[PDB]
Amino acid sequence: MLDAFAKVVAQADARGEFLTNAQFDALSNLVKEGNKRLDAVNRITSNASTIVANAARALFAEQPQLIQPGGNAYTNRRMAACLRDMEIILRYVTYAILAGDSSVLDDRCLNGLRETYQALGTPGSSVAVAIQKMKDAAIAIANDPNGITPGDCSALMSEIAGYFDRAAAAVA
Amino acid sequence: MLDAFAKVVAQADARGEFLTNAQFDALSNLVKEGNKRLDAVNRITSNASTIVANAARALFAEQPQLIQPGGNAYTNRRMAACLRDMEIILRYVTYAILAGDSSVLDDRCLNGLRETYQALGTPGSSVAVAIQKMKDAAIAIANDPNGITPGDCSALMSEIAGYFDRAAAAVA
Amino acid sequence: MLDAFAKVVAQADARGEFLTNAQFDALSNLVKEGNKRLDAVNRITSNASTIVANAARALFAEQPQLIQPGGNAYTNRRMAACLRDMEIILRYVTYAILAGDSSVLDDRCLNGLRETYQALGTPGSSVAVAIQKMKDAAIAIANDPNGITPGDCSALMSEIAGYFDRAAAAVA
Amino acid sequence: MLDAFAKVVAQADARGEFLTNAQFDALSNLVKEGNKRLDAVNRITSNASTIVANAARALFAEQPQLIQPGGNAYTNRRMAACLRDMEIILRYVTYAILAGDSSVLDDRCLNGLRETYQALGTPGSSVAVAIQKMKDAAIAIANDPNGITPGDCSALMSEIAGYFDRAAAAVA
Amino acid sequence: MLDAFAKVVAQADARGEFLTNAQFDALSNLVKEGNKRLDAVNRITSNASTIVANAARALFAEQPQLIQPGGNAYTNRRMAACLRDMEIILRYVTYAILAGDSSVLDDRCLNGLRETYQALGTPGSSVAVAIQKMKDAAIAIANDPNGITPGDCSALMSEIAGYFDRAAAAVA
Amino acid sequence: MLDAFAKVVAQADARGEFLTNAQFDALSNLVKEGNKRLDAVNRITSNASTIVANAARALFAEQPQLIQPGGNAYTNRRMAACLRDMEIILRYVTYAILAGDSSVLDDRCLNGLRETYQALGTPGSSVAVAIQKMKDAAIAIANDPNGITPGDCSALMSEIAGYFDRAAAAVA
Amino acid sequence: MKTPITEAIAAADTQGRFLSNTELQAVDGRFKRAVASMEAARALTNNAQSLIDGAAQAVYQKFPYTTTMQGSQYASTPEGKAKCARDIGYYLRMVTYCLVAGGTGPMDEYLIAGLSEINSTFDLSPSWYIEALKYIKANHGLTGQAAVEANAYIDYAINALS
Amino acid sequence: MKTPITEAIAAADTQGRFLSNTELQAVDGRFKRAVASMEAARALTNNAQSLIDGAAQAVYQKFPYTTTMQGSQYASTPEGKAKCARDIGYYLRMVTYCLVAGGTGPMDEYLIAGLSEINSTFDLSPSWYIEALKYIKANHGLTGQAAVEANAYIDYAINALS
Amino acid sequence: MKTPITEAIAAADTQGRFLSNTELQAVDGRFKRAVASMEAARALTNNAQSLIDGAAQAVYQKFPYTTTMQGSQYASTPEGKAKCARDIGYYLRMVTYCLVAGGTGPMDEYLIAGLSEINSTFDLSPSWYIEALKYIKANHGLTGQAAVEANAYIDYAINALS
Amino acid sequence: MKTPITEAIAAADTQGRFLSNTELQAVDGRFKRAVASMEAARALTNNAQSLIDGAAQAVYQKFPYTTTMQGSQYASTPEGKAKCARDIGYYLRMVTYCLVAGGTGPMDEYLIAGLSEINSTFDLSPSWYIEALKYIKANHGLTGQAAVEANAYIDYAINALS
Amino acid sequence: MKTPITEAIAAADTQGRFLSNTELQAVDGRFKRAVASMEAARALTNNAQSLIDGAAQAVYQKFPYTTTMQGSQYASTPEGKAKCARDIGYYLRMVTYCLVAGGTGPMDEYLIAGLSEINSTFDLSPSWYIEALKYIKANHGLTGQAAVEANAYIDYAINALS
Amino acid sequence: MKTPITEAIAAADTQGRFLSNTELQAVDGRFKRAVASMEAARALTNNAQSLIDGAAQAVYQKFPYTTTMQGSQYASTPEGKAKCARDIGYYLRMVTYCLVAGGTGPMDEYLIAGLSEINSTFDLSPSWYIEALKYIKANHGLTGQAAVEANAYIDYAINALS
Ligand SMILES: *[C@@H](C)[C@H]1/C(=C/c2[nH]c(/C=C3N=C(/C=C4\NC(=O)C(CC)=C4C)C(C)=C\3CCC(=O)O)c(CCC(=O)O)c2C)NC(=O)[C@@H]1C
């Protein structure tokens, strides 16, 4: 696993190089933006249960075939596995937000997941819908202007959306 | 693993349906025939050692290449493994008889067995001969009219032969 | 694992045959040559650290790309793994010398090693260079005429070179 | 583990003896009483959750020190462990009822339990109160004259009470 | 494991009580003193190898019986085990400094250590001498007035000495 | 585990001493007597099954209580365990003969065996009788003057008897 | 799936053994009890609609807030009433499956595994389902050993919710 | 008990390592955040009675049946009202402990472990406690980073009940 | 000891579960079969001496060398004849125990565990015991399901020797 | 396959070590003993037919029933006589292989593994083979350390059958 | 790679948990300390050549034999002088990486893993590198908490060599 | 302790087997080689003082800084000269023990286990000890197989330091 700082170090070590002034500046800027990143992680995590449950309810309303007898989320064991997957994906996305790097999400969650769903018969396209719903809710929560010192988090929200889109593309 | 009753339940659950009167009747009929099924399992199991040993002796008499030096059943370790396989296959066939469903035989015994024999160099065609010999002996024992209340077990014997043929087809 | 004696026994058992006089003679001759084989193993093993270290230093002098930042033997962990592989290969070659048969080397060391190096990105061609350097040093040490009862070890040295060449071919 | 039949067999084997007519008669009588034993197990098990929960609520009402901060059943982890113990003891008592022998209860539940509670600081006297409450409720349920073919289960209820008293004595 | 804050919480929970103003004040004061605690841990850890090695050399100079053939620290395996124990004890003492509570040291290091040394034949009195030597060196390093913002660390040094004395008393 | 040579080395290392001429002479004499030791091990091992079985048959003839129903060697599982113990003890005695030192027998077989038999209810006195019977048979076989180059093995037989007596004393 | 037959086989198989008389007796017990179990399963199926409809109303009568409180977890909308009737029908269907199979396997696999997680996630109260099951037990109309069979599996579900 | 300090130590110890700068930074972060955490803990403690009293009434207003329905699991008797006020006070006390300790350890050990089992066994609805916690969050009167601290642990409890 | 009842309990216990209907059916099957099993056990016991005496002679007739060959493993001395009669009585006693217990447990524990080791160590031929068991099966005089019960356990022993 | 050389290598390899003097001595011991072992192996091979023929007759003389008793496990037909001569030749061949290899590996792998199962399944008596081996030991004609070598492996086989 | 952020994530992940406030505090501590760490990393980088050149000469002054003794492990040839300057530059580069990453991970992975094996294999003395590191610590020119940061990682390397 | 005899026993014991001819050959090899090993051990012992004294001076000649450099790890004081002579005597004593025992066990247990840790902790250079061992090898005065024995264990120690 790498965070954003370790990523720059790893690239430099492969070249055998000390960091340049521009690289130092870029990492100093990440630190200066760090409070916003902590707020986003806190806000998403603090609302994780409703992000998951609301997205799940909406998926099953739009895709009732998943919950009809014989569908992939029918029976409580399969429903529980589906909710668990949503929680897992959200969890690893929040790890990537804290790290400022997708490696933890790619390595511990997304790699091989498409093949897992294919072996099981789980519709990865429907998982991607659930992920996109969680994305929209998580960004609305993280970027809520109420109750926080005003400032611009647009770059961070674009980064957050990227991690969610990466997960959705990995399963679809 | 499924038995004949669980199989019907599983099919109904995938449709989200209660059982029909015809399905209830079919399962009641299996119960009414149950004594014959218990007799067949008891009789085959009670003669398992001779079913195996007689079939093995006959195989090696017809196929002496298996026991010549260099043959697949030469050495006591390979002979013992061959006898063990015969006992294993007979055991799982008797489980299928008790269950009235082949799932235990397919899942715990037959799936992957062809590939196992190919990796080892064991002639699956010769295993199928041994299985067919055990089939004939087991049916003659299970369907012996002496020492049992007279009645018709022909349907059950056809079912039993089917399980043996399934095993023979899976290895050949 | 087989030694030279077990190899002959295994071939005979597959034919169901007692040994012939010529086969007995060949194994008696291996025994009569046994002191030379023990000397070769003792001499190579007793110089294992310098055989490895000298061959490694020479490899990196000829192939500086391996030790430049980003190269496969850069960082102390990768350097240590590379030295370890050299020690491992030398160790299994010496086992083959003692046994008079390559089976231990093939089974416990060489089989699958090419695929291991391909998955890691390790240049098998460069490993083969290191092996050839160890070969030349080990033979010069084993066949040193000083400090030993004079006699002809040329057949044994050809056998030893064969094991090293086998290892080099397996990785290249 | 022994059931009532295995117990008689074990005693006879230690003497090297076939069973006597009186011993056969005693075991035949246990079989003839078997329906009552099955009813008792079914009835107690079918009400296990309320037997446990009612007994627990009553214990804590009579012994509020257990639930005050600092008490042995304060915190949800300790409360859950206490409820679990009650379920475990009831479970093993029902096993003894089915078996007609206390060995399973003694061997898998009661042996060493007093020492466990002493190491933890759990008041075994209070556990015995909970067990006695479960006993009274379980017997009232098992021996309910409504909804069952009328007959005398008094001997069986005395046996059931004995198993509960054995458990209470083992912890107190 | 507890730190100084968890210790106060645990005492309060056993009473079922919110914290008092005095308890809040005491924990706020620990936080206000936290930089000194971090300096002490950094300084001791940063000099761990010399603290251990100097104390060991001095022990063996004063107690040459430990290193004479037959002595408890004779042979490289026993010498290495002795040095390891010194490193382990220093490590757990530094954990206690960071935590402001001895529980980690007591639970993971000191409990049972006296009995370990008695079973092995290791002289616990001599271990206590080594611990006292490490104490004196660690405090001199942690409390060095050079190279640090001037202030009074006397209370902290008394706390540190207490942890070392606790370890020495536990082995002697 | 020590052999006779390692024992002398261990005693010398605890004193920090090179060996004396007398110690070298004593170990050279053990080597010079080595053929006799190999013969004794070969002869006892080559007759292990009859040594065990004859001693067992004689024990049960003299001590019929062991095989009466309820006795410690009644049932095939207990008989098999008893025969196994006899084989185990003989095996470890032969190891001690090869080593010229009892450490392997003491450490891997005899230590704790008395307590094992006490926990099980096995009569250690009767085990000692079986051991003594094996001793007498093993010495008669090892010291048989037929079929071997004539010479005096009396010292070795006294050593062998000592190992058997040590085992008998450890269980009785 | 857990039935008396698959448990007998699984026991033999775990031990690497052919079936013995020990296991054949267990299956005979199942075949004999199946007479009562099938009577119960057919009756519950034949009267399934009235039992489901009556059970849902028993829940609404015991817990009137479920008919009025705002939220998708409640039966205060047509959609929520339909979810609740569906769920009660699931429970009853699982009872009939246990009766047909002679054991708890169907309910264990299709309903009880994950049950606690679902009820917590979707804010569904276990007490609601307990009341529906109590109504079914009280009103299935069975007697004798058929009633004993039905009630064993209904009470099993109640225990799983408790 | 999980705090930033015990987690730092446990990490070093699992690795068999002395503490490094990696771990000392984590503890400094805790010491700096403790200013806000202690402000929150003191405020919640000072106003604990009004918060508990108001939170209980918020539950009764959201779920009026809890004040009238017969059963010992409800607040329809003096004893049940006292149990409920006690429990809400437990939750608030645990929040203050998390703030004091700088992490979730106190609530994890004393309340969350076994929580699901207790609520199922005693028929206590998680939604009741969620509403009490929402009231505390809305009405604790904190601002700035003290509010962020309090709300982190209140929302942690809500997540544990969901 | 393996009986249908201890197997039912052990299954529940391995799963950490109360007994369910799945297991109670297995025990009912055992209680019903016990009528036939007890008839067989009483008959074999009542006629044990004639069965043992006849079975020993069947062995000696099939394998005449066992009456004449020198060696303590043979029945060519009074002591060896007594050992053989004892052993055959052990087998028959174990059959009656299996019938009483409703399963193979008694024979498994007291006779089959270690059987191969004993026969190899003492040079006892499994075929001798197979012939004794075949004689008992042919001549026990039972009919109907009592015969089925006896023969199941006799054939189990024969399989164990094969 | 177990020989002194493969055991020496396997010891070093299990320890992750190069061969040491400890292991080279073991191999020298094997090379020196091979003089006697090869003398024995050549002699047993040269006289294999007379040893096999004499050994089979020793079995038939010790156990006359094997020549007359009906059954395919006996030597009372031409086919059974040929099976028995084949088997005795297998044992003798394995002895020569052990001598050539310097250890028990050949007999362990090709004959002893599965031996008990084969003799039980096919109703072959271990005592028959013990008698054949005793005849070979008594009559191989070897002296000195060649005899010691042959007898070590013959007695190893006898122990495996006991 | 070990940093305060990856350690916080790894802790949550090992426990199967979302990040909690416990972990976010650790990351805030890292972000705040990064001000000093980055000052140190930039200064060491800006002065890297003079520090490396001075450190190599400090080694040669402490251990004059390294400039004269024959052997490729010594700095008595142009090639050996270049290897030594390269290695010292590696150490300094790793210190700057630890400062950038906020923990020991870079040095652990790229230098310390395998360090003992390399120094033993190539006959490089740990004391040489300790002296170079002591020179860098004495002469980096930093003050305040930037010096504390640099010295923590320099002393970590010295400990790894001791 | 690893010797050819304890390795033979340990092999049999790991396999649960009596000793076989496979193992007795290994011990015979050890007994035969012991003639040369004991000659070497006696000679090294008889000349131990001159070998130790000469070896220490060889180290000081190869590494003159060890006689002058300040520090307790060096031989620049009487105490350090005595430590070095002691250590060299330890190595030579261990060589004689390996020769007596017929394997590496004594040196493995008393010297090599922990060797790397001791040399790193106390700043002792492996090259110093390698030079002492090379001197002993060059100057022990042995010929023939006694020299081969001594040199095997001396070179084993050199390998352990490399
Ligand atoms: C986009 C995310 C929205 C936004 C963010 C924003 N936050 C701050 C200021 C601060 N945020 C924190 C939060 C934390 N510090 C910690 O250590 C932790 C973990 C326990 C957290 C959650 C802090 C302490 C501050 C500084 C004090 C303050 O409250 O201001 C800012 C201000 C700029 C800055 O980076 O500091 C901003 C912009 N604001 C919005 O409007 C977005 C919707």
XYZ file of N, CA and C in Angstrom, chain I residues 49-109:
183
model
N -24.626 -69.810 24.153
C -23.695 -70.918 24.305
C -23.729 -71.837 23.092
N -24.918 -72.190 22.610
C -24.989 -73.102 21.470
C -24.438 -72.435 20.219
N -24.704 -71.134 20.049
C -24.134 -70.405 18.911
C -22.614 -70.349 18.967
N -22.045 -70.064 20.138
C -20.584 -70.019 20.273
C -19.986 -71.400 20.011
N -20.558 -72.425 20.632
C -20.036 -73.778 20.477
C -20.125 -74.231 19.028
N -21.258 -73.982 18.381
C -21.406 -74.350 16.988
C -20.495 -73.551 16.081
N -20.312 -72.265 16.386
C -19.468 -71.423 15.547
C -18.014 -71.860 15.620
N -17.528 -72.187 16.819
C -16.142 -72.647 16.925
C -15.937 -73.900 16.092
N -16.875 -74.840 16.168
C -16.717 -76.059 15.381
C -16.795 -75.781 13.890
N -17.594 -74.795 13.470
C -17.617 -74.425 12.061
C -16.240 -73.957 11.610
N -15.548 -73.187 12.456
C -14.201 -72.746 12.107
C -13.269 -73.945 11.973
N -13.309 -74.855 12.949
C -12.416 -76.008 12.920
C -12.705 -76.902 11.728
N -13.962 -76.988 11.310
C -14.314 -77.774 10.132
C -13.843 -77.106 8.847
N -13.946 -75.787 8.763
C -13.497 -75.084 7.567
C -11.976 -75.094 7.462
N -11.294 -75.006 8.602
C -9.840 -74.856 8.671
C -9.271 -75.945 9.586
N -9.256 -77.203 9.132
C -8.854 -78.293 10.037
C -7.455 -78.117 10.614
N -6.552 -77.446 9.899
C -5.199 -77.249 10.424
C -5.197 -76.511 11.758
N -6.232 -75.715 12.058
C -6.259 -74.995 13.329
C -6.384 -75.933 14.521
N -6.783 -77.194 14.304
C -6.938 -78.167 15.378
C -5.681 -79.001 15.587
N -4.733 -78.969 14.632
C -3.576 -79.853 14.661
C -2.229 -79.143 14.613
N -2.152 -77.967 14.010
C -0.866 -77.318 13.797
C -0.291 -76.832 15.121
N 1.013 -77.038 15.282
C 1.695 -76.650 16.505
C 1.877 -75.133 16.534
N 1.534 -74.532 17.651
C 1.754 -73.111 17.866
C 0.661 -72.563 18.752
N 1.019 -71.587 19.579
C 0.039 -71.054 20.513
C -1.048 -70.224 19.840
N -0.875 -69.821 18.580
C -1.920 -69.103 17.859
C -3.029 -70.020 17.365
N -2.844 -71.332 17.455
C -3.804 -72.305 16.958
C -4.584 -72.947 18.097
N -5.657 -73.624 17.715
C -6.544 -74.313 18.655
C -6.200 -75.794 18.767
N -4.915 -76.104 18.820
C -4.429 -77.471 18.884
C -4.050 -77.904 20.294
N -4.361 -77.099 21.298
C -4.163 -77.380 22.709
C -5.431 -76.978 23.444
N -5.618 -77.453 24.678
C -6.784 -76.982 25.448
C -6.785 -75.479 25.629
N -5.616 -74.884 25.853
C -5.539 -73.444 26.062
C -5.967 -72.694 24.812
N -5.546 -73.173 23.643
C -5.907 -72.502 22.408
C -7.377 -72.660 22.061
N -7.940 -73.845 22.321
C -9.382 -74.029 22.160
C -10.160 -73.064 23.041
N -9.689 -72.843 24.270
C -10.374 -71.930 25.174
C -10.234 -70.481 24.712
N -9.055 -70.088 24.213
C -8.907 -68.738 23.658
C -9.877 -68.522 22.507
N -10.019 -69.522 21.641
C -10.860 -69.350 20.466
C -12.328 -69.237 20.864
N -12.782 -70.105 21.769
C -14.158 -70.011 22.246
C -14.410 -68.676 22.928
N -13.429 -68.206 23.705
C -13.526 -66.888 24.330
C -13.710 -65.807 23.278
N -12.854 -65.802 22.257
C -12.924 -64.760 21.237
C -14.261 -64.783 20.516
N -14.732 -65.969 20.129
C -16.023 -66.040 19.440
C -17.135 -65.507 20.329
N -17.092 -65.842 21.618
C -18.038 -65.263 22.560
C -17.932 -63.747 22.629
N -16.713 -63.199 22.531
C -16.555 -61.741 22.484
C -17.294 -61.156 21.293
N -17.098 -61.734 20.104
C -17.790 -61.222 18.926
C -19.298 -61.249 19.125
N -19.834 -62.374 19.604
C -21.282 -62.471 19.752
C -21.779 -61.470 20.787
N -21.050 -61.329 21.892
C -21.417 -60.357 22.913
C -21.443 -58.952 22.327
N -20.477 -58.624 21.475
C -20.449 -57.292 20.874
C -21.637 -57.083 19.952
N -22.036 -58.114 19.204
C -23.236 -57.994 18.381
C -24.438 -57.652 19.254
N -24.598 -58.347 20.389
C -25.752 -58.048 21.233
C -25.677 -56.618 21.770
N -24.472 -56.135 22.081
C -24.326 -54.767 22.569
C -24.714 -53.754 21.500
N -24.315 -53.990 20.248
C -24.708 -53.084 19.177
C -26.216 -53.035 19.054
N -26.862 -54.200 19.155
C -28.317 -54.249 19.079
C -28.957 -53.457 20.210
N -28.448 -53.606 21.436
C -28.964 -52.891 22.607
C -28.775 -51.386 22.458
N -27.604 -50.974 21.992
C -27.272 -49.563 21.859
C -27.827 -48.937 20.588
N -28.282 -49.735 19.633
C -28.792 -49.223 18.382
C -27.744 -48.738 17.411
N -26.494 -49.155 17.560
C -25.492 -48.750 16.595
C -24.197 -49.492 16.821
N -23.196 -49.116 16.030
C -21.950 -49.867 15.987
C -20.979 -49.512 17.105
N -21.258 -48.477 17.898
C -20.328 -47.962 18.874
C -19.652 -49.002 19.757
N -20.417 -49.927 20.350
C -19.769 -50.901 21.243
C -18.730 -51.729 20.517
N -19.074 -52.250 19.342
C -18.113 -53.061 18.603
C -16.949 -52.215 18.116
N -17.228 -50.990 17.666
C -16.163 -50.092 17.231
C -15.141 -49.881 18.336
N -15.611 -49.596 19.553
C -14.703 -49.195 20.624
C -14.015 -50.386 21.271
